[PDB]
Amino acid sequence: AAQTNAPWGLARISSTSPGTSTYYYDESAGQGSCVYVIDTGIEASHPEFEGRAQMVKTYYYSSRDGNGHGTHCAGTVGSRTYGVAKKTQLFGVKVLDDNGSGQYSTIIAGMDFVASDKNNRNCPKGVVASLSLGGGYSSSVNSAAARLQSSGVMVAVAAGNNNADARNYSPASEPSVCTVGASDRYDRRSSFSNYGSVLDIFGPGTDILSTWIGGSTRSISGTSMATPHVAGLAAYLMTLGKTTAASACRYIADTANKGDLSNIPFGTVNLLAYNNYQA
Ligand SMILES: C[C@H](NC(=O)CCC(=O)c1cccs1)c1cccnc1
């Protein structure tokens, strides 16, 4: 399948070269997979989600996304127009308040929630979790991300936006999950993207158009935006049968575009997520 005039990041993940605007993907589109978006919530009523999104957990007085960030990330995973995996099921877990903040204990509870809650959902092709959040290093946060991965969920986490080594941030620094840096439309590392040996992959992260609250759309930037490209890619590849939750990060790294990004520090991988789709 082909989606013309797609957001540049969707085109980029299905291309061997920058500078194109059509997204190419197998029409299965992540059907039968599930992606949890652990964030500020999801505006599930947005027409772009087509009834495929639902809130399953909140730690606050409401499950509504009063911020927009979670809705934007969910849109990059799986919205009809802005999403990688246009037929996946999306599950929202609100661990961040409407200011985008949350304590580590709540984030840990949300990860352990997903590890259990996946057993209440129908996800025959596999389960992914997208974590576009982070803070300073915490062994407890890293352990929670490691548990979620071990339970059979492909965990994708943002590297962070400090132009610094991601080893000092969590859950970015957990080795067993998939840590995602950000690139721009000219194949440069995004200026704010963290780096380091703990990174596994880069995805599009600068000027990413996706869904927003109020039934709207907007373009924003961050490793938060790169992470759901990788999460949606994992769901898409799992539906195709090419990989599993335990192996998807390695598979994405194996099949990535290699050596194409500029301003990658020595010792950080030069790997850009790629769906390897041949129409
Ligand atoms: C993730 C980032 N802001 C945070 O304050 C970190 C949230 C978090 O996990 C914390 C780590 C240490 C104290 S709290 C963010 C994400 C989305 C929207 N706006 C901001």
PDB file of all heavy atoms in Angstrom, residues 184-205:
ATOM      1  N   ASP A 184      16.039  14.336  11.956  1.00  0.00           N
ATOM      2  CA  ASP A 184      15.267  15.312  11.201  1.00  0.00           C
ATOM      3  C   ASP A 184      15.139  14.892   9.737  1.00  0.00           C
ATOM      4  O   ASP A 184      15.680  13.871   9.302  1.00  0.00           O
ATOM      5  CB  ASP A 184      15.811  16.736  11.413  1.00  0.00           C
ATOM      6  CG  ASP A 184      17.079  17.046  10.604  1.00  0.00           C
ATOM      7  OD1 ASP A 184      17.509  16.269   9.728  1.00  0.00           O
ATOM      8  OD2 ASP A 184      17.663  18.113  10.902  1.00  0.00           O
ATOM      9  N   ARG A 185      14.407  15.708   8.973  1.00  0.00           N
ATOM     10  CA  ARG A 185      14.042  15.315   7.613  1.00  0.00           C
ATOM     11  C   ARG A 185      15.220  15.314   6.655  1.00  0.00           C
ATOM     12  O   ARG A 185      15.090  14.785   5.542  1.00  0.00           O
ATOM     13  CB  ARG A 185      12.943  16.223   7.062  1.00  0.00           C
ATOM     14  CG  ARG A 185      13.422  17.638   6.784  1.00  0.00           C
ATOM     15  CD  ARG A 185      12.363  18.482   6.092  1.00  0.00           C
ATOM     16  NE  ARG A 185      11.303  18.893   7.003  1.00  0.00           N
ATOM     17  CZ  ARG A 185      10.030  18.544   6.875  1.00  0.00           C
ATOM     18  NH1 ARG A 185       9.621  17.773   5.882  1.00  0.00           N
ATOM     19  NH2 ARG A 185       9.144  18.994   7.758  1.00  0.00           N
ATOM     20  N   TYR A 186      16.353  15.890   7.052  1.00  0.00           N
ATOM     21  CA  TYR A 186      17.567  15.858   6.252  1.00  0.00           C
ATOM     22  C   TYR A 186      18.567  14.852   6.784  1.00  0.00           C
ATOM     23  O   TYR A 186      19.757  14.931   6.457  1.00  0.00           O
ATOM     24  CB  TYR A 186      18.181  17.252   6.137  1.00  0.00           C
ATOM     25  CG  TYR A 186      17.224  18.254   5.545  1.00  0.00           C
ATOM     26  CD1 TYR A 186      16.602  19.202   6.342  1.00  0.00           C
ATOM     27  CD2 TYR A 186      16.937  18.244   4.188  1.00  0.00           C
ATOM     28  CE1 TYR A 186      15.726  20.120   5.806  1.00  0.00           C
ATOM     29  CE2 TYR A 186      16.055  19.158   3.643  1.00  0.00           C
ATOM     30  CZ  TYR A 186      15.456  20.090   4.460  1.00  0.00           C
ATOM     31  OH  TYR A 186      14.576  21.003   3.925  1.00  0.00           O
ATOM     32  N   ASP A 187      18.100  13.898   7.591  1.00  0.00           N
ATOM     33  CA  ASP A 187      18.937  12.818   8.105  1.00  0.00           C
ATOM     34  C   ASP A 187      20.050  13.332   9.013  1.00  0.00           C
ATOM     35  O   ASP A 187      21.147  12.773   9.041  1.00  0.00           O
ATOM     36  CB  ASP A 187      19.486  11.924   6.984  1.00  0.00           C
ATOM     37  CG  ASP A 187      18.461  10.929   6.468  1.00  0.00           C
ATOM     38  OD1 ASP A 187      17.347  10.849   7.046  1.00  0.00           O
ATOM     39  OD2 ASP A 187      18.775  10.219   5.484  1.00  0.00           O
ATOM     40  N   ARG A 188      19.787  14.400   9.746  1.00  0.00           N
ATOM     41  CA  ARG A 188      20.677  14.835  10.812  1.00  0.00           C
ATOM     42  C   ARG A 188      20.109  14.334  12.130  1.00  0.00           C
ATOM     43  O   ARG A 188      18.888  14.294  12.308  1.00  0.00           O
ATOM     44  CB  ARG A 188      20.728  16.358  10.861  1.00  0.00           C
ATOM     45  CG  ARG A 188      21.211  16.983   9.567  1.00  0.00           C
ATOM     46  CD  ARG A 188      21.275  18.489   9.682  1.00  0.00           C
ATOM     47  NE  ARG A 188      19.941  19.071   9.677  1.00  0.00           N
ATOM     48  CZ  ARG A 188      19.519  19.997   8.827  1.00  0.00           C
ATOM     49  NH1 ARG A 188      20.315  20.507   7.903  1.00  0.00           N
ATOM     50  NH2 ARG A 188      18.264  20.426   8.910  1.00  0.00           N
ATOM     51  N   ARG A 189      20.980  13.967  13.066  1.00  0.00           N
ATOM     52  CA  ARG A 189      20.503  13.814  14.432  1.00  0.00           C
ATOM     53  C   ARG A 189      19.819  15.104  14.855  1.00  0.00           C
ATOM     54  O   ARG A 189      20.345  16.195  14.631  1.00  0.00           O
ATOM     55  CB  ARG A 189      21.673  13.535  15.376  1.00  0.00           C
ATOM     56  CG  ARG A 189      21.207  13.388  16.831  1.00  0.00           C
ATOM     57  CD  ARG A 189      22.304  12.875  17.761  1.00  0.00           C
ATOM     58  NE  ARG A 189      23.455  13.765  17.836  1.00  0.00           N
ATOM     59  CZ  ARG A 189      23.616  14.725  18.735  1.00  0.00           C
ATOM     60  NH1 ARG A 189      22.701  14.968  19.663  1.00  0.00           N
ATOM     61  NH2 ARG A 189      24.738  15.443  18.722  1.00  0.00           N
ATOM     62  N   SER A 190      18.625  14.985  15.433  1.00  0.00           N
ATOM     63  CA  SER A 190      17.949  16.162  15.956  1.00  0.00           C
ATOM     64  C   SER A 190      18.835  16.833  16.997  1.00  0.00           C
ATOM     65  O   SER A 190      19.499  16.165  17.790  1.00  0.00           O
ATOM     66  CB  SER A 190      16.612  15.765  16.589  1.00  0.00           C
ATOM     67  OG  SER A 190      15.794  15.069  15.658  1.00  0.00           O
ATOM     68  N   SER A 191      18.839  18.167  17.000  1.00  0.00           N
ATOM     69  CA  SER A 191      19.822  18.900  17.801  1.00  0.00           C
ATOM     70  C   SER A 191      19.697  18.596  19.288  1.00  0.00           C
ATOM     71  O   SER A 191      20.702  18.610  20.010  1.00  0.00           O
ATOM     72  CB  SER A 191      19.672  20.402  17.559  1.00  0.00           C
ATOM     73  OG  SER A 191      18.433  20.876  18.041  1.00  0.00           O
ATOM     74  N   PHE A 192      18.484  18.325  19.759  1.00  0.00           N
ATOM     75  CA  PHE A 192      18.217  18.045  21.162  1.00  0.00           C
ATOM     76  C   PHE A 192      18.372  16.572  21.525  1.00  0.00           C
ATOM     77  O   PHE A 192      18.294  16.237  22.711  1.00  0.00           O
ATOM     78  CB  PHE A 192      16.773  18.449  21.475  1.00  0.00           C
ATOM     79  CG  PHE A 192      15.777  17.863  20.501  1.00  0.00           C
ATOM     80  CD1 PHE A 192      15.373  16.539  20.614  1.00  0.00           C
ATOM     81  CD2 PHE A 192      15.282  18.618  19.447  1.00  0.00           C
ATOM     82  CE1 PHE A 192      14.487  15.984  19.699  1.00  0.00           C
ATOM     83  CE2 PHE A 192      14.386  18.065  18.535  1.00  0.00           C
ATOM     84  CZ  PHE A 192      13.994  16.748  18.665  1.00  0.00           C
ATOM     85  N   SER A 193      18.532  15.677  20.557  1.00  0.00           N
ATOM     86  CA  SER A 193      18.432  14.251  20.858  1.00  0.00           C
ATOM     87  C   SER A 193      19.582  13.801  21.737  1.00  0.00           C
ATOM     88  O   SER A 193      20.747  14.076  21.443  1.00  0.00           O
ATOM     89  CB  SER A 193      18.459  13.418  19.578  1.00  0.00           C
ATOM     90  OG  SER A 193      18.297  12.034  19.882  1.00  0.00           O
ATOM     91  N   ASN A 194      19.259  13.057  22.789  1.00  0.00           N
ATOM     92  CA  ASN A 194      20.302  12.351  23.506  1.00  0.00           C
ATOM     93  C   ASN A 194      20.948  11.302  22.603  1.00  0.00           C
ATOM     94  O   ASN A 194      20.441  10.953  21.525  1.00  0.00           O
ATOM     95  CB  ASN A 194      19.745  11.705  24.773  1.00  0.00           C
ATOM     96  CG  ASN A 194      19.488  12.716  25.871  1.00  0.00           C
ATOM     97  OD1 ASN A 194      19.847  13.889  25.764  1.00  0.00           O
ATOM     98  ND2 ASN A 194      18.880  12.259  26.954  1.00  0.00           N
ATOM     99  N   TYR A 195      22.098  10.803  23.052  1.00  0.00           N
ATOM    100  CA  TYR A 195      22.918   9.874  22.287  1.00  0.00           C
ATOM    101  C   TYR A 195      23.551   8.898  23.272  1.00  0.00           C
ATOM    102  O   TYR A 195      23.230   8.898  24.463  1.00  0.00           O
ATOM    103  CB  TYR A 195      23.972  10.641  21.472  1.00  0.00           C
ATOM    104  CG  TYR A 195      24.757  11.624  22.313  1.00  0.00           C
ATOM    105  CD1 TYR A 195      25.833  11.207  23.088  1.00  0.00           C
ATOM    106  CD2 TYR A 195      24.372  12.956  22.387  1.00  0.00           C
ATOM    107  CE1 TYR A 195      26.530  12.107  23.880  1.00  0.00           C
ATOM    108  CE2 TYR A 195      25.056  13.853  23.167  1.00  0.00           C
ATOM    109  CZ  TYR A 195      26.129  13.424  23.914  1.00  0.00           C
ATOM    110  OH  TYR A 195      26.815  14.326  24.695  1.00  0.00           O
ATOM    111  N   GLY A 196      24.457   8.066  22.781  1.00  0.00           N
ATOM    112  CA  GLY A 196      25.238   7.191  23.632  1.00  0.00           C
ATOM    113  C   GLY A 196      25.095   5.734  23.239  1.00  0.00           C
ATOM    114  O   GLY A 196      24.268   5.354  22.413  1.00  0.00           O
ATOM    115  N   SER A 197      25.931   4.912  23.878  1.00  0.00           N
ATOM    116  CA  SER A 197      25.933   3.484  23.596  1.00  0.00           C
ATOM    117  C   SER A 197      24.610   2.812  23.941  1.00  0.00           C
ATOM    118  O   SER A 197      24.312   1.750  23.390  1.00  0.00           O
ATOM    119  CB  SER A 197      27.072   2.791  24.347  1.00  0.00           C
ATOM    120  OG  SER A 197      26.983   3.044  25.733  1.00  0.00           O
ATOM    121  N   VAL A 198      23.817   3.389  24.843  1.00  0.00           N
ATOM    122  CA  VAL A 198      22.559   2.743  25.210  1.00  0.00           C
ATOM    123  C   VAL A 198      21.486   2.892  24.130  1.00  0.00           C
ATOM    124  O   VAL A 198      20.496   2.150  24.143  1.00  0.00           O
ATOM    125  CB  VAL A 198      22.079   3.210  26.595  1.00  0.00           C
ATOM    126  CG1 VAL A 198      21.529   4.621  26.531  1.00  0.00           C
ATOM    127  CG2 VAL A 198      21.072   2.233  27.188  1.00  0.00           C
ATOM    128  N   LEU A 199      21.640   3.831  23.200  1.00  0.00           N
ATOM    129  CA  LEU A 199      20.673   3.949  22.119  1.00  0.00           C
ATOM    130  C   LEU A 199      20.707   2.716  21.235  1.00  0.00           C
ATOM    131  O   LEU A 199      21.774   2.167  20.937  1.00  0.00           O
ATOM    132  CB  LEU A 199      20.976   5.171  21.261  1.00  0.00           C
ATOM    133  CG  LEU A 199      20.202   6.426  21.648  1.00  0.00           C
ATOM    134  CD1 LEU A 199      20.669   6.949  22.999  1.00  0.00           C
ATOM    135  CD2 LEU A 199      20.320   7.494  20.573  1.00  0.00           C
ATOM    136  N   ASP A 200      19.524   2.299  20.792  1.00  0.00           N
ATOM    137  CA  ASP A 200      19.401   1.179  19.871  1.00  0.00           C
ATOM    138  C   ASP A 200      19.081   1.598  18.450  1.00  0.00           C
ATOM    139  O   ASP A 200      19.411   0.862  17.514  1.00  0.00           O
ATOM    140  CB  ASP A 200      18.311   0.213  20.345  1.00  0.00           C
ATOM    141  CG  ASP A 200      18.618  -0.372  21.698  1.00  0.00           C
ATOM    142  OD1 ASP A 200      19.494  -1.260  21.763  1.00  0.00           O
ATOM    143  OD2 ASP A 200      18.010   0.063  22.700  1.00  0.00           O
ATOM    144  N   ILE A 201      18.446   2.756  18.257  1.00  0.00           N
ATOM    145  CA  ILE A 201      17.856   3.093  16.969  1.00  0.00           C
ATOM    146  C   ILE A 201      17.499   4.567  16.995  1.00  0.00           C
ATOM    147  O   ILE A 201      17.280   5.145  18.068  1.00  0.00           O
ATOM    148  CB  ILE A 201      16.605   2.198  16.743  1.00  0.00           C
ATOM    149  CG1 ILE A 201      16.071   2.291  15.300  1.00  0.00           C
ATOM    150  CG2 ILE A 201      15.503   2.543  17.771  1.00  0.00           C
ATOM    151  CD1 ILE A 201      16.994   1.655  14.261  1.00  0.00           C
ATOM    152  N   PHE A 202      17.432   5.176  15.816  1.00  0.00           N
ATOM    153  CA  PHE A 202      16.865   6.500  15.632  1.00  0.00           C
ATOM    154  C   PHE A 202      15.567   6.408  14.843  1.00  0.00           C
ATOM    155  O   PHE A 202      15.402   5.539  13.980  1.00  0.00           O
ATOM    156  CB  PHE A 202      17.835   7.432  14.889  1.00  0.00           C
ATOM    157  CG  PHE A 202      18.951   7.927  15.749  1.00  0.00           C
ATOM    158  CD1 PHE A 202      20.059   7.131  15.996  1.00  0.00           C
ATOM    159  CD2 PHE A 202      18.884   9.170  16.341  1.00  0.00           C
ATOM    160  CE1 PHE A 202      21.086   7.585  16.817  1.00  0.00           C
ATOM    161  CE2 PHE A 202      19.898   9.619  17.159  1.00  0.00           C
ATOM    162  CZ  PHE A 202      20.996   8.829  17.393  1.00  0.00           C
ATOM    163  N   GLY A 203      14.666   7.337  15.131  1.00  0.00           N
ATOM    164  CA  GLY A 203      13.467   7.520  14.341  1.00  0.00           C
ATOM    165  C   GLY A 203      13.193   8.995  14.102  1.00  0.00           C
ATOM    166  O   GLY A 203      13.792   9.869  14.737  1.00  0.00           O
ATOM    167  N   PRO A 204      12.275   9.306  13.189  1.00  0.00           N
ATOM    168  CA  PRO A 204      11.945  10.715  12.919  1.00  0.00           C
ATOM    169  C   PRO A 204      11.416  11.421  14.162  1.00  0.00           C
ATOM    170  O   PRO A 204      10.466  10.956  14.798  1.00  0.00           O
ATOM    171  CB  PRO A 204      10.872  10.610  11.832  1.00  0.00           C
ATOM    172  CG  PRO A 204      11.180   9.302  11.139  1.00  0.00           C
ATOM    173  CD  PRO A 204      11.593   8.387  12.262  1.00  0.00           C
ATOM    174  N   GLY A 205      12.019  12.564  14.495  1.00  0.00           N
ATOM    175  CA  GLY A 205      11.659  13.259  15.717  1.00  0.00           C
ATOM    176  C   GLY A 205      11.542  14.765  15.627  1.00  0.00           C
ATOM    177  O   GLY A 205      11.061  15.390  16.576  1.00  0.00           O
TER     178      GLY A 205
END
